[PDB]
Design a protein around this ligand. Structure first.
Ligand SMILES: [Hg+2]
Ligand SMILES: [Hg+2]
Ligand SMILES: [Hg+2]
Lengths: 509, 509
């Protein structure tokens, strides 16, 4: 075995099953949702074209990395003549494969050079290096405009940032005047209309009246609901004690299985009359054998005791939280209201993405929800929801469904579709939860057919797609001219981070 | 070709590479930390010896399940013997393998029966069926007492439950008198000393003054910390504006890397003096090219601007949330204080488990933390910590490290050891977060050598270990006498849930 230097991995570089080299132009960092937005949208392209320095580590340009990769292939190809003597025609296959990759890589190098030298009369590329807050090059914008599987969405945070860099968002709603368009640069000028305003002003009003968040654990909800029908003075005592206890057991059981069958229908058979060994839960058992309560105990203590004796502790294990419920007891500041408003808007945006990627609607949902009376209404229902501790996602889905037609939808969203949206929302929101700015996000679905791909933690397009567009078709691709279509013929737009085909020459050794 | 009926899976049943059948006696449900505690501790053993009913579904005893398995092997053995005319000897190996498993299974059946019939004259087994809140049988207690990889810990909730069932906890602290030991059964009798009391009374005092929880994101923490040395009136203006800006950049940088090197030391080289392209961050750039701030802007706006211009958005990606910060703004009830008190105690217990399983100490850390002045001191620091939004875990680790010797430790805990404890703590606490009682937990490490195993979501011991101990060595195991050592010679104490060996005797034919 001879020591090869060709790496199994370079940035932006993917090799398919047929030994075609693809270069992937990055748009932003991330997998499905971009972590970069606004001010920082250009960061990946700056690096791809010019290199940069991140947290003290030098990141090299694509061109610089293709040159390094070329040297490495050339050294590997030199070493296969010498190797050739040890195996005249037993290293044949890998040599052909390496030369094929080399020729391709050389062509990409010429394309990057000719792009920067001949075809950047606009400075569309050079402004990545020179501009203050650079823009996406126009070819990237065109690729995004035309995408069928990736879409930007733009929201309305109170303290909005003017430097959005995704110009064709699918979802969009009215925004304030950014502080950065005001002479002091300190505060926005607010608008008193639209989805953003309604949410904020409903969730924490001019009054400063907090909105309570009454989210309980399943156990507390059930216990609280049962105890609704009792008063503090109520006891399990007197002549009818056995009968009052039975009433208690039955209400508690009905309430607990009602809540549980929402999530798991197996619990339709759950029973609180008996312990797991078949012992009757009755007065004598709880008071005189176990000694846990007595005639003077409050109804809440009896509930606790009943539950401790009959319910597996696996039934109390929680669901994963909604992003809507983060542990706070109240919405008690403008900042609390902004945070929730954004979460509501982001959910509407995910629903909008879902309907656009699955070809149900072309509408911008924000156009509908910015209008009265919808803006006020959805805000009001979300607020009620928090006060009741209700699930917030369905409140949004019902409102969508009651207006499906006006949102460009043939039919209401099915329960399955709602859950798919909720899951995307939850995962994408959590990835993005700590963003310094919430004005816009780019969201890509690499499991669908389209011009955007996922690769090495970058949301990307095909370099040749970009090249053809910035170049306006004036420089034909030659040997690479079918590479774009070849990547489309692949099974998934999600691309393996390593290049297996390069290691399968070392595996055979 | 015959279809075989022997199942690939039975409860408690594991078959190793050499065709040895192992029966695993369950202690409690779970993987690393038991979900059963107190009153429910016995549930798995009740079920293993007698069966029981869970959420309306019957769970059958080991004995019943071994019998079913036996019938199935017998059918499989009939069906090979009907094929001896048709395929003279072609089934030989598998027939031996099935008879071997059958004999083993029959022996286990005999052992369970003989244990219940001849070796239970104290009713140590029978009490699981007949007692109110049963105990672990003595052999299980002996196994736990001598385990090197699993340990119970006992805590002090305010409203403590007397029915603990883990008798030899590693970590233990003073407790109140349980309400269940009082004639009314309504409230515990409190002690005014010890870790539990100090935590509760410090975190929410008799005053009823709330303790603020001022938790911030990494970004807000850093910004807040920097701004704590500036006044609202401070500006980046005047003759020394460039110099004041450099001071700001240096402080901001120092503070940000201090916070980041805790999680990842790669950020020791992070710099805020240049953007990723090498553009110097100075007054002219921020005020006149980007136009984000001016001379009158507050220092907070300059910080925002500096950070947006120099920091990758990957650095704001959060660590998993600590159980200590659950989204609340304040500790404002006895309940809130009890909840936090438990979390602090559980962390100390996890540290104690870590030091015991890795052979750093044999001490009960609770003995140390119950004593003054440590009980008061650790409470007072945890309270300061919440008020400052500091990480709580390191506060506990520093206090341990400053007293490592009195806690039986040769050296302080390393940064790595701390993070390992934090991860265990976090994952275990979240698993048990909804327990109806927090008095005790059983924690097992199946990646270490010892007498306790993980199998089919049950924390288990070897049945034969248990058998030999309950019978006091008076009934030798015969053919099974080396099965215990054989399971120890395995690679892991995490046992595969299915039995591959039973499915792979079919591949060879
Ligand atoms: Hg910026
Ligand atoms: Hg109980
Ligand atoms: Hg079994």
């Amino acid at each position: 075995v001879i020591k090869f230097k060709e790496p199994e991995r370079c940035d932006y570089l993917y090799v398919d099953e047929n030994n075609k080299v693809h270069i992937l132009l990055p748009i932003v960092g991330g997998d499905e949702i971009g972590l970069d937005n606004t001010c920082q949208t250009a960061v990946e392209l700056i690096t791809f074209f010019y290199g940069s320095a991140h947290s003290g580590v030098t990141k090299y340009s694509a061109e610089h990395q293709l040159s390094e990769y070329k040297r490495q292939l050339e050294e590997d190809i030199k070493a296969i003549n010498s190797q050739k003597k040890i195996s005249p025609h037993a290293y044949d296959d890998l040599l052909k494969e390496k030369i094929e990759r080399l020729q391709q890589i050389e062509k990409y190098i010429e394309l990057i050079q000719v792009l920067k030298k001949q075809y950047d009369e606009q400075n569309d590329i050079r402004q990545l290096r020179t501009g203050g807050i650079p823009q996406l090059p126009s070819g990237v914008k065109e690729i995004i405009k035309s995408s069928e599987n990736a879409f930007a969405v733009r929201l309305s945070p109170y303290d909005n940032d003017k430097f959005t860099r995704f110009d064709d968002p699918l979802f969009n709603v009215k925004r304030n005047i950014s502080k950065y368009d005001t002479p002091s640069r300190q505060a926005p000028i607010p608008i008193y209309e639209g989805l953003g305003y309604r949410l904020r002003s409903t969730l924490f009003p001019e009054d400063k009246t907090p909105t309570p968040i009454n989210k309980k654990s399943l156990r507390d909800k059930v216990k609280s609901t049962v105890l609704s029908h009792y008063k503090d003075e109520d006891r399990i005592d007197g002549e009818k004690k056995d009968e009052k206890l039975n009433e208690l057991i039955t209400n508690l059981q009905n309430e607990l299985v009602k809540e549980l069958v929402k999530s798991d229908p197996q619990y339709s058979k759950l029973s609180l009359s008996k312990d797991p060994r078949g012992k009757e839960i009755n007065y004598d058992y709880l008071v005189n054998s176990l000694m846990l309560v007595d005639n003077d105990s409050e109804i809440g203590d009896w509930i606790d005791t009943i539950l401790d004796a009959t319910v597996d502790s696996t039934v109390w294990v929680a669901q994963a939280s909604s992003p809507f419920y983060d542990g706070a007891k109240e919405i008690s500041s403008d900042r609390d209201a902004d945070k929730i408003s954004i979460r509501v808007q982001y959910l509407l945006a995910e629903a909008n993405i879902y309907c656009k990627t699955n070809k149900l609607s072309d509408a911008n949902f924000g156009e509908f929800f910015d209008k009265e009376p919808h803006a006020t209404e959805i805000a009001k229902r979300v607020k009620e929801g928090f006060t009741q501790g209700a699930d917030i996602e369905p409140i949004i889905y019902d409102y969508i469904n009651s207006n499906h037609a006006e949102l460009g939808l043939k039919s209401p969203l099915t329960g399955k579709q709602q859950q798919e949206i909720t899951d995307k929302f939850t995962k994408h929101y959590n990835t993005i939860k700590e963003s310094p700015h919430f004005d816009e996000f780019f969201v890509a679905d690499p499991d669908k057919k389209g011009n955007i791909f996922s690769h090495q933690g970058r949301i990307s397009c095909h370099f040749l797609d970009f090249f053809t567009r910035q170049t306006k078709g004036k420089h034909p691709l030659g040997d690479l001219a079918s590479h774009q279509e070849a990547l489309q013929e692949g099974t998934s737009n999600r691309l393996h981070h390593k290049n297996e085909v390069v290691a399968q020459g070392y595996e055979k050794l």
